[PDB]
Design a protein around this nucleic acid. Structure first.
Length: 54
DNA sequence: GCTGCCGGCGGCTGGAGAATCCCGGTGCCGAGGCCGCTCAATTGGTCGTAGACAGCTCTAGCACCGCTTAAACGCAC
């Protein structure tokens, strides 16, 4: 999987399956997806507005 | 003396993962009516267990005295 060999996840535009484990879940955080807990914040990214519906 | 310096400290934050409530449908099983019959109630006689009274007399309590040893006291460790 090019995603895999790239040591990178799958983005919703990948052709990894709709359940391909190489995808990424998305922010769930409650107060702000901002502090040292929120997973997006760790694997430094911005919680996409399709996922962090929280 | 004080400079970092460093470690710990407790205090807090908030994610996370399970336990909680609610509601919406759904049955099978408590619950109730039914018929009946057999066993429980009614009537009636008895004689004997069981209650009395009147009993004897054994023994369980009270005491007393004198004994002694087991109890009580303390005591280093």
């Amino acid at each position: 999987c090019p995603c895999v060999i790239a040591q990178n996840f799958c983005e919703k535009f990948c052709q990894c399956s709709s359940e391909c484990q190489n995808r990424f879940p998305g922010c769930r955080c409650k107060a702000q997806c901002n502090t040292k807990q929120c997973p997006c914040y760790l694997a430094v990214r911005e919680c996409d507005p399709d996922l962090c519906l929280t």
